[PDB]
Design an enzyme around this catalytic site. Structure first.
Site: not given
Ligand SMILES: O=C(N[C@@H](CCCCNC(=O)c1c(O)cccc1F)c1ncc(-c2ccc3ccccc3c2)[nH]1)c1cncs1
Ligand SMILES: [Ca+2]
Ligand SMILES: [Zn+2]
Ligand SMILES: [Ca+2]
Length: 368
Positions: A187, A264, A135, A21
């Site tokens: 930077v 997604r 991040h 998931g």
């Molecule tokens: O909103 C919160 N989390 C966000 C984080 C989204 C981070 C996106 N990262 C990038 O786009 C990115 C990038 O920009 C560059 C390089 C690499 C990258 F990955 C979140 N959206 C969806 C989930 C999700 C859904 C299903 C799940 C199922 C199984 C286990 C975990 C799952 C996680 N998680 C919160 C957290 N704590 C409080 S609120």
């Molecule tokens: Ca700077």
């Molecule tokens: Zn992103």
């Protein structure tokens, strides 16, 4: 004219699995690689398998304790690390998975290796689609990122470049990179992202840097539904002004594909052509350029995006009809490279786009 391109990839990268998931699918890197191979883009670039970045290389930015933790934790010993997991934000978004450390080593190795190649003046562009993990923080994982390959690659570029420009077109604010360099003028970080009730919560228009770094952090906050037209109103004018004022000698461009229509997790409406126009704009300045990956969750579109951006880096036209490849069925029902925008409303009015651009231009007038 045409530029030399070095491309970094390890065939094992697609085997790392975040768990059932979890939206992050490293397999998308393997799909990208296989598609660009089937388009024949390997005949025009030097392909390298990067080394596994060492813990010592990672501690040029990250804390020793955090890197030691990443190199020690495994699914079979997780129960003994409940305290450190909380401290380092390893849990739901950033899980412990088999080979986590090696995945970090490969993602980081590609970005650092590309930066070394640019420093040696042995390439015009270096590409690492497994990188762009903006991040990750000094002592904390975040947003599916563990090791900030971007910060490490920029520290490598800073050995030979007085000023480095970082541009980030992922849908999410480039928070880890902005924080790492927030108080330096060596930077400049420029992030275009969705802002408002959205991860990671930072990147307000008014976050412009601090101390010697004041005016060296630029944030363009956006609403849902931005399209190729809206992005086109502001990207080239802002990057042109930044190039004019800052005069960087090297550039790092994070090409996160979660800003595409139909993502997604994302809420933007860019096409692959609209997203790739950013690569065209940056490449035009003819500066040493490191192109990195990032987010992207509708994996057929990530593969299309990064294949097309590799063709853009090579100044190579490729047909819209997809060639046969190992993942051909993922590209149905059309089997084409380019995508169409959805009918979602663009909440970024043309007036809002011009107004935010004007506020950023005011801040750019403050550079020496
Ligand atoms: O909103 C919160 N989390 C966000 C984080 C989204 C981070 C996106 N990262 C990038 O786009 C990115 C990038 O920009 C560059 C390089 C690499 C990258 F990955 C979140 N959206 C969806 C989930 C999700 C859904 C299903 C799940 C199922 C199984 C286990 C975990 C799952 C996680 N998680 C919160 C957290 N704590 C409080 S609120
Ligand atoms: Ca700077
Ligand atoms: Zn992103
Ligand atoms: Ca961004």
């Amino acid at each position: 004219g045409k530029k030399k391109v070095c491309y970094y990839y390890d065939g094992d990268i697609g085997n790392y699995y975040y768990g059932q998931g979890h939206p992050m699918k490293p397999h998308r890197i393997r799909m990208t690689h296989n598609l660009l191979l089937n388009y024949g883009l390997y005949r025009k670039m030097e392909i390298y398998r990067p080394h596994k970045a060492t813990a010592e290389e990672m501690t040029k930015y990250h804390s020793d304790e955090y890197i030691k933790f990443l190199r020690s934790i495994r699914p079979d010993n997780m129960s003994e690390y409940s305290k450190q997991m909380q401290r380092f934000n390893v849990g739901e978004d950033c899980p412990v998975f088999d080979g986590l450390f090696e995945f970090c080593q490969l993602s980081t190795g590609g970005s650092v290796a590309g930066a070394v190649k640019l420093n040696r003046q042995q390439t015009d562009m270096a590409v690492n689609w497994a990188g762009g993990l903006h991040h990750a923080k000094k002592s904390e994982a975040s947003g599916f990122c563990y090791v900030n390959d971007i910060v490490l690659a920029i520290l490598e570029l800073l050995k030979y470049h007085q000023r480095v420009l970082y541009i980030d077109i992922d849908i999410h604010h480039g928070d880890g990179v902005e924080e790492a360099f927030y108080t330096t003028d060596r930077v400049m970080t420029v992030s275009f992202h969705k802002y408002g009730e959205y991860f990671p919560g930072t990147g307000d228009l008014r976050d412009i840097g601090a101390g010697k770094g004041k005016y060296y952090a630029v944030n363009f906050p956006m609403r849902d539904g931005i399209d190729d037209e809206s992005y086109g109103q502001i990207f080239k004018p802002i990057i042109s002004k930044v190039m004019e004022m800052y005069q960087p000698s090297a550039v790092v461009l994070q090409c996160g594909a979660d800003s595409l229509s139909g993502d997604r997790l994302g809420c933007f409406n860019l096409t692959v052509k609209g997203h790739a126009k950013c690569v065209e704009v940056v490449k035009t300045f003819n500066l040493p350029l490191l192109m990195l990956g990032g987010g992207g969750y509708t994996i057929r579109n990530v593969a299309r995006c990064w294949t097309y951006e590799t063709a853009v880096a090579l100044d190579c036209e490729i047909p819209n009809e997809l060639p046969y490849n190992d993942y051909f069925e993922y590209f149905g029902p059309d089997f084409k490279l380019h995508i169409s925008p959805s009918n979602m409303t663009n909440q970024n009015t043309p007036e809002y786009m011009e107004k935010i651009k004007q506020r950023l231009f005011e801040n750019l007038r403050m550079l020496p």
